[PDB]
Amino acid sequence: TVLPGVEAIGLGYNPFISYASVNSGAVQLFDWATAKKREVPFKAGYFVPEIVDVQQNDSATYTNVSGNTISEYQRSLATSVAIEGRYNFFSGSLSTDFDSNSLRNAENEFTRIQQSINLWSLRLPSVKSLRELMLPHMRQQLDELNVNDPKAISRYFDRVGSHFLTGIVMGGRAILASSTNKLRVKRDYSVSVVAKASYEGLTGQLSAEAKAKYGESISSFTQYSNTHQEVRGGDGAKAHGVFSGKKEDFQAWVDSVSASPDFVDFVPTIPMQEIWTLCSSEAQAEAMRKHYDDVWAPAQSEKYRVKANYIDQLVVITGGSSTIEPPVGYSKIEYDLNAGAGGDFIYLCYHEQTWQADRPKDAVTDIRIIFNKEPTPPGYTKLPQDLNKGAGGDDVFLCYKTEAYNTDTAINKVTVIGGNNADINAPYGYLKVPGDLNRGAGGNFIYACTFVGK
Amino acid sequence: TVLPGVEAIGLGYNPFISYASVNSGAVQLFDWATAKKREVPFKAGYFVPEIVDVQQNDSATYTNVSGNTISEYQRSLATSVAIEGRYNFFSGSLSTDFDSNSLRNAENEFTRIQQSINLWSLRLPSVKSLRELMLPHMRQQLDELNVNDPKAISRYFDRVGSHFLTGIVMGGRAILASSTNKLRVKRDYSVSVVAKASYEGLTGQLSAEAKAKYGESISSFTQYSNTHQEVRGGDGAKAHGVFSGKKEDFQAWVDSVSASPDFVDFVPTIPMQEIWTLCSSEAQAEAMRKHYDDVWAPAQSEKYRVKANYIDQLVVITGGSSTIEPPVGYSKIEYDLNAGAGGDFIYLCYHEQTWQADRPKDAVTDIRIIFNKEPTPPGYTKLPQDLNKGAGGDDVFLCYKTEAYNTDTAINKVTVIGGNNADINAPYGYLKVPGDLNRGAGGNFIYACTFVGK
Amino acid sequence: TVLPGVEAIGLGYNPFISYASVNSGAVQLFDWATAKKREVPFKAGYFVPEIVDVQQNDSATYTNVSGNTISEYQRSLATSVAIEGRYNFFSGSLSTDFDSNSLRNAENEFTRIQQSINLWSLRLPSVKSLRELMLPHMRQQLDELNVNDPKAISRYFDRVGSHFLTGIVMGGRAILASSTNKLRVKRDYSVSVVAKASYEGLTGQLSAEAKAKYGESISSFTQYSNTHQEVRGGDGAKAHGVFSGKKEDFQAWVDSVSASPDFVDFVPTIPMQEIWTLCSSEAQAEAMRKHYDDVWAPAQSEKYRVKANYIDQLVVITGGSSTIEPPVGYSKIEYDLNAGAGGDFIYLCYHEQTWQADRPKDAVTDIRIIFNKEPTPPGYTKLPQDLNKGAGGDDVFLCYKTEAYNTDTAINKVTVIGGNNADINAPYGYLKVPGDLNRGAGGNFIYACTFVGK
Ligand SMILES: [Mg+2]
Ligand SMILES: [Mg+2]
Ligand SMILES: [Mg+2]
């Protein structure tokens, strides 16, 4: 009887596809049916190939990743494992942890809370005899790889993986992933704290005193965030009970992870080894390593870089009540451009465009206010509504310029801010336009603020 | 005893016919009865051919695909699998996920929510010895393929498939597919969020707090969308219970998927391999690969491109009450062209034509308003009803031009918008015609808006 | 023990006779008693000939076909299977899905809702060794076919079929076929939506919320349509329970399909192969293929083309009450030709003739109104009743021309439309005649509208 996980160690792995999942590896490079076995010291009746070192490490454990923005989350994710380079490792998990719009939505900040239920971990040393344990066809394929063609190496890394697993933890994990509107959730605590506290709440691990302390903070987090939930290892008939809010259901799953563990986490010291560790020629290793970091890992990292949504069109709507509503394609900035100035209610509305590789639109890239009679600046559009309509004052018109999309300049968000002071502060990172949308009218000073993510 | 799924790995597959279904593959290329077996480490008493690598990966998992338009959904679907080129892969599933009119209806946006219930996954390496495992008649047929005739290669890809499966996940899946009127569903959340939340509601996975938060949003989604439901793997006598709204029925199905799993999903890293990987001559592979992407995959992708419905005829109806009703062939734009102007109620009505390959009609391609006495512009039709009938003012007449169908110019939708401002905003992507359908009359300004999908 | 369905794969098949039914195939071309067997991996204790590939695909599935007109339904039916050419494949099913008058009735639109209960599917590869498995007399008959006589080939395709089955799905199916009066059913949803929803209602699959949403729409669909119902596979003593409105009865049938499945659907990728794939001489294949598409498939497709009913005679009836009634041979257009004009009630009545191949009558092909004293136009008939009898005004008479039947010009329907506006709109695709049937009288303007299906 082989120890569970011997099938999963040595598996050829693609870092970018996913984190700590076997779906990220393509086929097993090493032959362990033929190899000499060793009995597992702590689990008599189970055997492993003598090359692997298996340590018991029974320990329920946390791995938490967070970032105020996706490009930050992608780096705190990538650095969660001892691995070389700045590449967006594990970043393929984004496509399944988070809703695709919510990755593109620049108002979100992201947290992933993973409770690993460790049981044991299998380790594989970097000794030169590893080559002798490869399956013959795998060794033959690697030995005949035509490293004189970049496409062959690139296909090899794609088809076989760039690394192979050398550190495995076998157990269970429950994960909660969440994206949270960072403009509107309560800031009393860091979102990782209320993320973890709400994860503990959903699993019932949150104590009576913590439940009171976090309990008011987690409701704000709960309503303003999209919590994806998943669970792995253990009895799938009990896996759905872990988020049942009841400790007996969570423990009933934990009591099943021991029977049927899965690959859930890496061993921090030696998670995986590069595939050219196994090739017999140093000149082959040089070509493969050179291709890996000169070409393949750059392209793979770039192909997992996520754009933000951007504004492509603005409109203004006017009417006699607070509840007037934009054309269906647009969404409304809820601050009245005549707030306190009387007259008509006026609202600024925008369209945010999803970026597309083959047909990016223009973004909006600049906005200006031109007032009474000044001509529209060269190449700007102008909205025909007077932004003091009914309010009196001077005639106010807003103009904006559109240009082909560039991440350096496509405006991601806009807002309107107003108050009694002329020197009013925009939200952090926003730039406000000069000129008052109630110039000459009564009421508040009002300014349009613009935000670019870069 | 062979492990379930050994019959399904190596199956020759057509990407375009469907996603993650065995109905998309035509016959098994590899002979695994003769081949040397290996016992499955985690399932003693089951065996596999020694070539395949089987990993346990017991993990309930989500794959979600969405798009504001079908051409977007077709690309988010195609990119849901690591596969080469921009072709409309898996796009044959459209014919069974969605109602055919609803694919043609440009007011719809599309979401597919799939919960895969994974159990294990079978992997097959790209080693050169695969050729030795092919069935002799399959190898003989591939070896004698007359690649000097494009029709022979095209028939081979059609009859045998262009790829073969190298990554298989065996388990269950429940799918909800929905098309939703994007003009009228609530925009509080992205439709993928309320799609997933309503899927969780139908399966009972939605929590008490999420049920409150989403519960008001999902009813709007529910009434304004056509949710197709299907389920695969597990006991077919319990499969219909999964959408019973009750967790005990859903779990009772999950508890049966473990006994009788099906091919439900791909392994993301190595889903399928090109068929010319197996041909012995590189000159044959060049001809097959060249034909695949120069001819066959283009034609197959194009033959899955979906037109939108288009307007081919307009009429106006007039009468003494709000509830007057068009001729049966037409449908009514519910905004009165004398709203606030008194007189007769007037409504604009249209026919939307289904596109046909052998007999496309004319579409409407331009609309104009000509008012009192100006002659009808060259080649335009004119509607005889005065669009201020009973309202006084100037005599208003609407004219439109029709031309043979072209996706670049066939108008897909029209609407009438009106309000107190002359500078009123059309819905996003609509173009409004110049001139007021109440010119000289009282009441609102009213304009006809036109939309082309391209 | 042979797997159920081995008798049905390889069966020589006629596409035109029916869809997915064994009654459409004439005798089995291949000998599988002698052939070497293979045990079915997923059903130990059942065997198949080693040539066939059997995949389990347990999946309850939908195939839906719809069209606003029969010639559209015939094409959406024909294209429901991957098969070559524009021929009216499967069109023989019309004679049993729909009432013959209702195919001829141009007011109907057609929907077929099929729920396939798949269990497994048998596949047969296009390998050259198929010829070796043919039964000797079948091979001898094909080898001696005198392809120098078109009648011999035509008789062979008629007697033996033009194709043979290569893809089989074994299971059950329940079908609802319906023809619906497209002029009078509610247009809130597409008829395929309320067809499917009412099918789900009859089988009990419609949910509580869908039952409310569709429930008012399905009653209109139900009363205005003729739903044929049939069921196939499973226990015939439980088959009639599937439309019992009760899920327990439907599931009780599904639980019996697993014991006694039938041929219910095709495998989409490889449904059937042309019969000249099996002939040994390419010169024979050329003659057979040339005959198939030059002669036989055209004639078979044409012999399944359905005419519409047409108007052959018109009469007018006059009297003192709304409820006056035509001569028994005619049916009445319910709009009074003196509506609002007082006097006598006047109604226009018509006879619609069934087309006959050996004795087509004249159709009506033109209609005119000649008023007071103008002579009857050359070759027109005239109705003697004044269409302002009792109403005063000018004397109104309707004239019509009859000509030998032609689908290009035989008028299929007529109607009378009236209202306060002179510029009133006819129903879509109708043409209204000039002149008012109340000219000089009071009341509404009234016009005769004519419709030709072509
Ligand atoms: Mg203002
Ligand atoms: Mg008007
Ligand atoms: Mg009259």
Numbering used by the authors:
A (entry chain L), B (entry chain M), C (entry chain N): 31 to 484
The authors write:
The protein is comprised of two domains—an N-terminal MACPF domain and a C-terminal β-prism domain. Pore-forming proteins (PFPs) are a major class of soluble proteins that oligomerize into rings and undergo large irreversible conformational changes to become transmembrane assemblies and breach the membrane of target cells.
A major finding that facilitated Mpf2Ba1 structural characterization is that gut fluid extracted from WCR larvae is necessary and sufficient to induce oligomerization in vitro in the absence of brush-border membrane vesicles (BBMVs) prepared from isolated gut tissue. Upon incubation in gut fluid, an N-terminal cleavage after Lys25, as determined through Edman degradation sequencing, and subsequent oligomerization step are triggered by interaction of monomers with yet unidentified midgut component(s). After gut fluid-induced oligomerization, Mpf2Ba1 monomers formed higher-order complexes that were isolated via size exclusion chromatography and imaged by cryo-EM. Moreover, it seems that the loop is re-oriented by ~7 Å to bring the highly conserved Ser54 from a solvent-exposed position in the monomer, in contact with His18 of the N-terminus, to a core-buried position towards the MACPF domain in the oligomer. This slight rotation disrupts the only interdomain H-bond between MACPF and β-prism, involving the carboxyl oxygen of Glu137 and the hydroxyl group of Tyr460.
